[PDB]
């Protein structure tokens with residue numbers, strides 16, 4: 001299940017960067033950006049395979065891709081943020 005809606009302005013600024021890359025269709029800093037997210041644990045709504053895709057949210061100072069990600073769904077404005085490597089998700093509201 002989804003934890004709630006969070007305004008874009010309330011998330012780290014790198015979340016804004018990723019959504020900009022997603023709109024311009026990259027390019028992305030990681031070759032893994034844009035792969036399918038399987039939703040294997042059923043935290044998000046059930047959808048066909050390939051409905052969700054994962055993009056990194058850069059963690060300042062990390063050597064690794066860290067724990068932040070943006071999950072997009074195929075619907076208009078459906079984008080979820082996770083800060084704990086897919087444990088919890090919040091829907092992103094780009095209007096605030």
Ligand SMILES: Nc1nc2c(ncn2[C@@H]2O[C@H](CO)[C@@H](OP(=O)(O)O)[C@H]2O)c(=O)[nH]1
Pocket residue numbers: 032035036037038039040041054085086
């Ligand atoms: N927990 C979890 N990870 C998933 C699922 N689908 C893809 N992934 C993860 O998404 C990433 C891209 O496939 C990988 O982790 P990563 O973000 O640590 O590399 C892989 O583990 C899923 O349904 N659940």
